[PDB]
Amino acid sequence: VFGEEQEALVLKSWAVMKKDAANLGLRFFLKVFEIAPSAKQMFSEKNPKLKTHAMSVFVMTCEAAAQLRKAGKVTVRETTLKRLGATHLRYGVADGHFEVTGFALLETIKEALPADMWSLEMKKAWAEAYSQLVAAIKREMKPDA
Amino acid sequence: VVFGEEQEALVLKSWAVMKKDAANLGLRFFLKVFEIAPSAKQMFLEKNPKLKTHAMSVFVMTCEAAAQLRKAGKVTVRETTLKRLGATHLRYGVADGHFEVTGFALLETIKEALPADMWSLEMKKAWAEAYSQLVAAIKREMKPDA
Ligand code: HEM
Numbered sequence: 231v232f233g234e235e236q237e238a239l240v241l242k243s244w245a246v247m248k249k250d251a252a253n254l255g256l257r258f259f260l261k262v263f264e265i266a267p268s269a270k271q272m273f274s275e276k277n278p279k280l281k282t283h284a285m286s287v288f289v290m291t292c293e294a295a296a297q298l299r300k301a302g303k304v305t306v307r308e309t310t311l312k313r314l315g316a317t318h319l320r321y322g323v324a325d326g327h328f329e330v331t332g333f334a335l336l337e338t339i340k341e342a343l344p345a346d347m348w349s350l351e352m353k354k355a356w357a358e359a360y361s362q363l364v365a366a367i368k369r370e371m372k373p374d375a
Numbered sequence: 376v377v378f379g380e381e382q383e384a385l386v387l388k389s390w391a392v393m394k395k396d397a398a399n400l401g402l403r404f405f406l407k408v409f410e411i412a413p414s415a416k417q418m419f420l421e422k423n424p425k426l427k428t429h430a431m432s433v434f435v436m437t438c439e440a441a442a443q444l445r446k447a448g449k450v451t452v453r454e455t456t457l458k459r460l461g462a463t464h465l466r467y468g469v470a471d472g473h474f475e476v477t478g479f480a481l482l483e484t485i486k487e488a489l490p491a492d493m494w495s496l497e498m499k500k501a502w503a504e505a506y507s508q509l510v511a512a513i514k515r516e517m518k519p520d521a
C-alpha cells in the first residue's frame with residue numbers, strides 16, 4: 231500500500247539531509263540520549279562508529295521504503311536481517327529502544343530539514359518505513375515461530 | 376587444573392564407551408534436564424529426533440572441547456561457530472542457570488551410563504571442565520566483547 235509519493239517523500243528529504251550527515255547523526259544521537267540516557271551504556275562525541283550507525287539507520291530506512299513500494303514488504307537480504315537481529319539482541323536493544331529511536335528520528339528530521347519540506351505526510355512516511363524495518367529486525371531477535 | 380593429556384583421555388575413553396548407546400543416552404540426558412527445570416521445555420517428547428540431535432551436539436562438542444583445550448589452549452569453532460552458538464542460545468533465552476542445570480544433568484547422566492569402575496572424581500572433573508569451558512566460550516558471544 232506504500233505509495234510512490236511516500237517513497238518519494240523519504241528519498242527527497244534524504245537527498246537533502248545526507249549533505250550534512252555527520253552532524254545529522256550527531257543530532258540523532260544526542261536526542262536519543264536526551265530521552266533515554268541509559269542507552270549510552272549500550273555503546274562504549276565524534277565517535278565514528280556512532281556516525282556509521284546513524285547513517286546505517288537512515289540508509290536502511292530509505293531502503294525499506296524502496297522495498298515497501300516494490301514488494302509491499304521489507305525484503306532485506308535474509309542474512310543481513312539475521313545478523314541485525316543478533317547484534318541488537320546481543321547488545322540488549324528492546325522494544326523501548328527501537329521506539330525512542332524512532333521518535334528521535336522524526337524529531338531529528340524535523341529539526342534538520344528545511345521547514346518548508348516538513349509536514350504530516352512526511353512524518354508518517356519516515357514513521358512507516360522505520361517501523362517496518364524494526365519489525366523485520368525484531369523477527370530475527372526471537373524464535374522463528 | 377589446566378586441561379592436559381590425562382583429562383582428555385578420560386573424556387575420550389568414556390565417550391567411546393557411551394557413544395555405543397548415544398540415542399538412549401541423549402534422551403536420558405535431556406529428560407533429566409526437563410525434570411530439574413520443566414520451564415526449559417518451552418525453549419524448544421521422548422520420540423522427538425530434534426531433541427536427540429541437540430543432546431548429541433552437547434556431548435560431541437564437549438568431547439571436542441576436550442581435545443582443543445589440550446591441543447590449543449582453548450575451545451574451537453568446529454562443525455559451526457561460537458558466534459552462531461552464542462546467537463542461537465541468546466535468541467532462545469538460555470541463561471547461565473540453564474547451562475548449569477544442563478551440566479549437572481550431564482555429569483549425572485554420565486555417572487549412570489558408565490561402568491562404576493570407570494567413574495571417578497577425576498572423571499567427573501574432566502567432563503565438568505571441558506563442559507564449563509565450552510559454555511564459557513559460547514556465553515562470550517552472547518555479550519559484547521569486553
Ligand atoms: C532499525 C534501526 C536500526 C538499524 C537499521 C540498525 C543498524 C545497525 C547496524 C548495521 C549495525 C552494525 C552491526 C552488524 O554488522 O551487524 C548496528 C549495531 C548496533 N546497533 Fe543498531 N540499528 C538500528 C537500531 C538500533 C537501536 C534502536 C539501538 C539501541 C538504542 C541500536 C544499538 C546498536 C548497537 C549497540 C550496535 C553495536 C555497535 C556497533 O555496531 O557499532 N541499534 N546497528
Ligand code: HEM
Pocket residue numbers: 415418419425429432433436437455459460463464467469473474475477509510513
Ligand atoms: C555447551 C552446551 C550446548 C551446546 C554445545 C549446544 C549446542 C547447540 C547447537 C549446535 C544448536 C543448533 C543451532 C546452531 O547451530 O546454533 C543448539 C540449539 C539450541 N540449543 Fe543448545 N547447546 C548447548 C546448551 C543448551 C542449553 C543449556 C539449552 C537450553 C536448556 C539449549 C537450548 C537450545 C535451543 C532452544 C536451541 C534451538 C533449537 C531449535 O531451534 O529447535 N542449548 N544448541
